[PDB]
Amino acid sequence: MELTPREKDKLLLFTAALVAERRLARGLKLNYPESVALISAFIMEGARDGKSVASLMEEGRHVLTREQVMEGVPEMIPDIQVEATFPDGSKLVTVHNPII
Template identity: 35%
Template sequence: MRLIPWEEERLQVFAAAELARRHRAAGLRLNHPEAVALICDAMLEAARAGASYTEVEAAGRAAVAPEDVLDGVRELLDEVRIEVLLGDGARVIALVDPLDRGAPPDRLGPGALVVGDHADVEINAGRETIELTVTSRSRRLVRVSSHYPFHRVNSRLELDRAAAQGFRLDIPAGSYVGWAPGESKTVRLVRYAGESGPNR
């Protein structure tokens, strides 16, 4: 059996989710990785069954109840992002506040970030960059995350994919760029570093 990287990742999510299901069935409360695995597994399964974007989001929100998790997990889990395959192509779904934590946690509570005073950090210094104009033909908002291979983005985005081969968005890790229906914008891409792989 030969698996592409995406399929290998899917099996890893399933294995983690299955372990989480066993722990929950045994009456154990879930830690952060277990909660994330269950949410991602539910969203991937919904997409596999042909669900819409909204239905996939709903499946993720229904996967784990706040009382299922250990203390502090709700504060840590502010967002879950995962790529799913829908009818109109691959989409990255950002599920914000999946455990309905409500008010933000205390500044020094679990998951808090304390940023020190330091000079601005220049990202991707000295790396090759290009600019491409991208137009969305989708009827929904399309988002592309920072490190996604740009030539593989949603098929409803019109761009020069040959030129985008080996590049990603030149933005901070974990962030994204979005296109509203019919929107066109020019983005800067940066070449991947390290050894070449099948997605670069």
């Protein structure tokens, strides 16, 4: 595999998102770390699929709504940023006010 430090680091993000994913499924209101991990992982898969940076900056704002997270959480996340390998290399996706 020859995993570089950055690839291994992303495995940590992925696993954190698995945690959040199961909790959301149980019907729980997500907290701060769970929300960040869930949305971030969604963007990474988006890039793997070949979606554009422009598209993801938008789609990322419709992953979780204010009723799916704990009080104060939307305000604790003014934005979310994550990089991934798009077909045209690594790119940064910034999702502003992801939780409405």
